[PDB]
Amino acid sequence: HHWGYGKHNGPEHWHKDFPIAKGERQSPVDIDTHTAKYDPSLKPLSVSYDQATSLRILNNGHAFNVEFDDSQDKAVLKGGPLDGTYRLIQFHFHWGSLDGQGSEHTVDKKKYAAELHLVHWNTKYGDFGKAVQQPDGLAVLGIFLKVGSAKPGLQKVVDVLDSIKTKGKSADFTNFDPRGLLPESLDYWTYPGSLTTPPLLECVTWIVLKEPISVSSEQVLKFRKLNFNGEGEPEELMVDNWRPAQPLKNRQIKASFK
Ligand SMILES: NS(=O)(=O)c1ccc(C(=O)N2CCCc3ccccc32)cc1
Ligand SMILES: [Zn+2]
């Protein structure tokens, strides 16, 4: 009886195995745009993805991860609110059953159709497993998806999904350029928070871009054909794999822009 997104094992149950679910710095959160303060001390984000080495795509039973070679500083995030160098390890998405829900963060209570998370770990801790035990161990770059025009840079991802339909399936996924998933603007909000799935560790500097990317209805429909279940098991469509907004508590969300 493992955690998931259903009635019986979904977010409102997670606290029983993972008591930190009710913690002081849990993610995601609603971003109230009027309350978020411009911080002129914040630097522009430095997204250095030119030398990124994608390797594989994995259906892990809760989402799909596009995995990168993080054995050296190739693809890194620095600047913004961060001190030091954060290495890209994987990206994944959260999405809905319909366009009106799917994002984890919200903006003045608005839910987007989906949310991209580019996950990075602080290289001063040496490995990812060490980093997740530190308050400044991870930096997750969050990008909203709205449904409209197709995102050309996402199509390679969409087209491989048929080959990783079920939990535990993986496929070779080399030479994928995540630059193709970014919006024009790197304006962002930032706050201290957590992983949004178990083990819900409070180890993340969140950086959420203001500008959504547009994807097509056909693109997101293909996400919704994935399966939570393993091969040969009763089909459970991988939809609504998002955690709702959590209490902000004693935290401040800062804006990089006026
Ligand atoms: N949605 S997110 O961007 O906040 C996110 C969530 C979880 C993770 C993540 O590495 N996992 C989660 C589950 C298995 C696991 C086991 C031990 C340490 C970390 C992890 C990474 C990024
Ligand atoms: Zn995520």
The answer to whether the CB of 119 is under 6 A from ligand 1 is yes
H or E, element range at 218: helix 217-223
Q: Residue 249: left if φ>0, alpha if ψ -120 to 50, beta else—which one?
A: left
Rounded distance between C-alpha atoms, residue 219 and residue 101, angstroms: 16
Among 119, 229, 199, 219, residue whose Cα is nearest residue 159:
219
Distance 40 CA to ligand 1 centre (A): 31
Q: Report which ligand 1 atom has the smallest distance to the Cα of 63.
A: 1
62 tagged catalytic: yes
Quickly list H helices, 108-177: 128-131, 155-160
Closest protein CA for atom 8 of ligand 1: 195
Rounded distance between C-alpha atoms, residue 181 and residue 222, angstroms: 17
Q: Are strands 204-209 and 138-147 parallel, antiparallel or unpaired?
A: parallel
Other C-beta atoms within 10 Å of 146: how many? Answer: 16
The answer to whether the CB of 143 is under 6 A from ligand 1 is no
Give the contacts of 253 (CB within 8 A, at least 6 positions apart). Answer: 29, 31, 32, 35, 36, 37, 189, 190, 191
**Domains of the chain with CATH codes:** 1-258 (3.10.200.10)
Q: Which ligand is nearest to the CA of 115?
A: 2
Distances (CA, A) of 247 to 27, 125, 200: 8, 29, 14
Residue 35 annotated in ligand binding: no
Distance 249 CA to ligand 2 centre (A): 21
Resolution value (Å, 1 decimal): 1.5
Residue 197 annotated in ligand binding: yes
Give the mutation target among 65, 195, 204 for probing the ligand 1 site: most ligand atoms within 8 A of CB.
195
Residue 117 annotated in ligand binding: yes
Method by which the coordinates were obtained: X-ray
